[PDB]
Design a protein around this ligand. Structure first.
Ligand code: FAD
Ligand code: N01
Ligand code: CL
Length: 531
């Protein structure tokens, strides 16, 4: 039930929005959060599908801002399941009395900057009108589900799900003919759970994605209690890294090594599981020949996982460099295809023509299904923003200004839109880092910036157009030194039809980006104009 006026309005109650609330209060600022969902958690509230699990270690993917949380919470598994992460979020939410600062079931429709008085007016689908000095869009990176692009969807006779909008009551696939469309992280995690229940599971794969064993395991309770002795320290080590974790930064070039040392080295990562293999060698995302030797080793591990050679071959990713679509952690996913009741439908060879009342037609034949699961992803990074009529100076639409790709200074603001801040979004490290590291830094940087504005008695903060252009050009420029922009992924907006193909993230590493933000604030916010 939202206030008519506030210092800062926050959109979204997932990790980012909750923390922004907590810190803004500590800083003696009035602050409120609007959230479409029924409750806190963001991705961990919405993504409730069976198998949903973090692929950053529970010990790294957690808040560090509170010593008490660090000491009191007990993680249980190398990689936390979604129910567990949702209990942690509730634990924190509870601990700091956060819900009192949040309006649920409410979706922000539009926001417009008022130049006369230097404020945002912010409307919602319940007619709430809030005036705020600052607007923080804590509204996610992977928060607006994307349906795939083919017809007959509303004609399907059975039940229809998207993993990103999963039912609050467990879904029963027992005895069903089930289809999953999509084999990114969502579909990889969800499929082996549905394989346990369905009479027949059909996995509709388009481009195969690279996946490596998670090797999840219980967490040793002693290791935990040790870790806690120096938790603050351990976390500060994670902030001083490109990826926001303890990942080893392999110093060698993947080209300098024999085939023999290369295999022995990747074999050790493969038996160990997890994503650290992405940094086995310094140049894997930088040099196509280096990349390829690593990609080959992975593809061969893939072939060897599946008994039938033809099914095995269709599982092998082709045509793009390893790691350039987000790396996936799998758990019994490749093994699944050895089962009698699991069918890999290769839609590259036979593309989907349409959905029918009965199920799915490809160019080669029709599949009958009782249920269809869409693991088809998200209109990423800009999708949630673009859903909101956001309006800056001269009445510029954010959606129009960014229609060729997101334009920002430090990913934190855009020229022409003063008092507006984007948490962990395009133009910053964002999902290229452990997101809790990217999220805590952006929250602390924005909220300090806000507090600094108040201290000094100002009320207007605007990214300077020339710095914005300079920043966007720098982002593209350093991306272009890597293999990232070369591949169609949601990072480059490739999954939404008509969306501009532009790599959206800052690739220079969390550490450098935090250093660059720190010198910006240390000079009273170079590249902003403050009045
Ligand atoms: C299934 C899934 C698994 C993930 N696993 C990991 C992982 O292992 N490691 C990792 O580092 N990151 C991973 N993440 C990335 C995840 O985006 C971040 O880690 C972190 O959860 C993002 O937090 P957030 O608060 O920025 O956004 P979100 O958690 O997305 O919260 C955004 C909230 O804003 C609300 N919202 C949006 N628009 C409006 C509006 N118009 N009005 C009102 N409310 C609105 C949404 O409903 C949502 O609740 C994963 C993401 C997905 C989708
Ligand atoms: C932490 C963790 O383990 C976890 C778990 C879950 C999510 N996450 C995080 O969220 C991000 C998104 O992952 P996701 O799986 O939900 O989404 P995706 O990666 O966008 O894959 C979409 C898939 O659907 C297929 N596809 C799309 N359109 C299609 C079409 N029109 N016709 C037919 N098929 C279509 C598309 O095919 P192709 O050829 O690759 O476009 C692909 O197979 C992740 O990267 C993590 O950041 C993390
Ligand atoms: Cl992720």
């Amino acid at each position: 039930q939202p206030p008519e006026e506030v210092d800062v309005l926050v959109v979204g109650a997932g990790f980012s929005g909750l923390y922004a609330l907590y810190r803004l209060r500590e800083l003696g600022r009035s602050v409120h959060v609007i959230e479409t969902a029924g409750d806190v958690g963001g991705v961990w509230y919405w993504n409730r599908y069976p198998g949903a699990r973090c692929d950053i270690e529970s010990i790294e993917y957690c808040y560090s801002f509170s010593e008490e949380v660090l000491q009191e919470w007990n993680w249980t598994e190398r990689y936390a399941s979604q129910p567990e992460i949702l209990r942690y979020i509730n634990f924190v939410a509870d601990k700091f009395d956060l819900r009192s600062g949040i309006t649920f079931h409410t979706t922000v429709t539009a926001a417009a900057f008022d130049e006369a008085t230097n404020t945002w007016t912010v409307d919602t689908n319940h007619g709430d009108r809030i005036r705020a000095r600052y607007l923080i869009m804590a509204s996610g990176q992977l928060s607006v589900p994307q349906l795939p692009n083919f017809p007959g969807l509303k004609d399907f006779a059975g039940n229809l799900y998207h993993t990103g909008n999963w039912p609050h009551e467990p879904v029963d696939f027992s005895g069903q003919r089930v289809g999953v469309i999509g084999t990114g992280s969502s579909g990889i995690q969800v499929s082996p759970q549905i394989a346990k229940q369905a009479a027949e599971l059909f996995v509709f794969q388009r481009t195969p994605h690279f996946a490596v064993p998670a090797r999840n395991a219980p967490l040793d309770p002693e290791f935990l209690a040790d870790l806690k002795k120096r938790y603050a320290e351990f976390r500060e080590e994670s902030r001083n890294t490109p990826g926001g974790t303890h990942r080893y930064q392999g110093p060698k070039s993947a080209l300098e090594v024999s085939d023999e040392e290369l295999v022995e080295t990747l074999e050790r990562y493969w038996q160990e599981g997890g994503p650290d293999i992405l940094a086995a060698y310094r140049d894997i995302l930088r040099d196509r020949d280096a990349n390829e030797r690593v990609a080959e080793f992975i593809r061969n591990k893939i072939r060897n996982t599946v008994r039938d050679p033809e099914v095995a071959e269709r599982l092998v990713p082709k045509g793009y460099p390893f790691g350039t679509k987000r790396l996936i952690l799998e758990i019994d996913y490749y093994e699944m295809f050895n089962r009698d009741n699991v069918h890999l439908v290769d839609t590259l060879s036979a593309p989907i023509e349409t959905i029918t009342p009965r199920g799915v037609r490809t160019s080669e034949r029709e599949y009958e299904l009782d249920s269809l699961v869409l693991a088809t992803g998200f209109d990423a990074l800009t999708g949630a923003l673009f859903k909101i009529d956001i309006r800056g100076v001269g009445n510029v639409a954010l959606k129009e200004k960014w229609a060729a790709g997101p334009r920002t200074y430090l990913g934190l603001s855009t020229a022409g839109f003063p008092n507006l801040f984007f948490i962990a979004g395009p133009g910053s490290p964002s999902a290229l880092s452990n997101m809790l590291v990217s999220i805590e830094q952006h929250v602390e940087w924005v909220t300090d910036h806000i507090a600094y504005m108040f201290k000094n008695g100002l009320t207007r903060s605007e990214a300077v157009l020339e710095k914005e252009d300079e920043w966007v050009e720098h982002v593209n420029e350093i991306a272009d030194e890597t293999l990232y922009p070369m591949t169609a992924s949601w990072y480059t907006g490739a999954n939404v039809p008509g969306k501009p193909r532009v790599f959206m993230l800052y690739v220079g590493g969390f550490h450098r980006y935090r250093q660059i933000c720190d010198e910006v604030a240390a000079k009273g916010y170079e590249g902003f104009v403050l009045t």
